[PDB]
């Protein structure tokens, strides 16, 4: 099923047919090559091609395993920015894509998990190596993920406002504004805080946060 022949030709064919885009046959060849040439002269390049193939072949979890193998294999490589960006991209791609994408359904009030993980990964990347080539789009992704998380928390606060549990709403929106003070979600969530204070018979604080609106009338 595989030719046990000198390595030069198998590497050459591997890069050539990955260059074609034959991932279904490239992943097997690359994994067999790596498992039979564990410490070749440039096995790092093999591992990076494995990352590329796994991501493009949509086998994200095994790609994640390869990422956390490579990071511990050599925590100091002159190309780790690419690996970190690929890890963050894997998280984000795993997070949100479904029939809602065709339907345009707002994926805000869904399970964050992967969103938080992706934000953490991208933030670690950008705060690590600002001189790299993967900072701009990374920063845009940070902004988008922050907006998504803020919208999720706003949605849950809105449901609690719909119910009438006028304490948990205060805690949730307080956490929002403590964590996410520079987003639209707090901007439309502040009136929920005002309503909760007014309904809670403790209006001594209510007008207080009302003054907040007085500073952002626009």
């Amino acid at each position: 099923e595989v030719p046990d022949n000198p390595p030069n030709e198998i590497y050459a064919t591997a890069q050539q047919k990955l260059q074609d885009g034959n991932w279904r046959q490239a992943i097997t060849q690359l994994e067999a090559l790596d498992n039979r040439y564990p410490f070749g002269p440039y096995s790092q390049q093999v591992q990076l091609d494995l990352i590329y193939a796994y991501y493009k072949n949509a086998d994200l979890p095994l790609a994640q395993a390869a990422i956390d193998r490579f990071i511990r294999l050599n925590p100091t490589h002159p190309n780790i920015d690419y690996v970190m960006y690929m890890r963050g991209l894997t998280n984000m791609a795993l997070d949100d894509s479904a029939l809602q994408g065709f339907f345009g359904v707002d994926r805000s009030d869904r399970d964050p998990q992967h969103a938080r993980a992706a934000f953490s990964d991208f933030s670690k990347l950008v705060r690590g190596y600002p001189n790299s080539q993967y900072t701009t789009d990374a920063t845009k992704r940070l902004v988008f993920l922050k907006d998504r998380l803020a919208k999720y928390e706003y949605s849950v606060a809105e449901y609690y406002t719909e119910r009438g549990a006028w304490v948990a709403v205060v805690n949730r929106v307080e956490g929002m504004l403590r964590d996410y003070p520079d987003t639209q979600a707090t901007r439309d969530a502040l009136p929920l805080m005002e309503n909760a204070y007014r309904q809670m018979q403790m209006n001594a604080q209510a007008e207080k946060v009302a003054k907040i609106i007085a500073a952002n009338s626009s």
Binding site: Y52, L89, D137, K140, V143
Partner: protein, 174 residues
Amino acid sequence: RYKRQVSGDEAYLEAAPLAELHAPAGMILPVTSGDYAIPVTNGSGAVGKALDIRPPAQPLRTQFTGDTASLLENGRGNTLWPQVVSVLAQKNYTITQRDDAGQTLTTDWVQWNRLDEDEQYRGRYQISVKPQGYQQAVTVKLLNLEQAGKPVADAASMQRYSTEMMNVISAGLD
């Protein structure tokens, strides 16, 4: 294209840039946790489909210091220049514009690497000089401007690949 691009979920670009929340006099907003914080960061980077996603080529003392390919420790290092001449033309229809025999000083000609990926003819020039620093006669190839499909470009990714094609040729054959 399904070849060298991120997934098509690229609508995240047109999101609202964040704006700060004013604190009125008489009260103070609570201290920011800072766990979800982004600092100011530079630009000048391709985004969306223009951004490149390809594995950077790891060079094969296998030198990898970007613009340089100074590998090295052979007593017959001077004999590598006629080997380079054999590589040129004879082995791969290549030619050095001005290559002395003893001096091992050559200037590369504008080549054409059509290695798929819709990568048109890429004209890479370089200077082939063999140093002997910290070892015997070393191999070195300082590349120059590349053409590819565009008239000119200086992205470090395509530049790295352009130098690495010669690097991998030299490493594989010797």
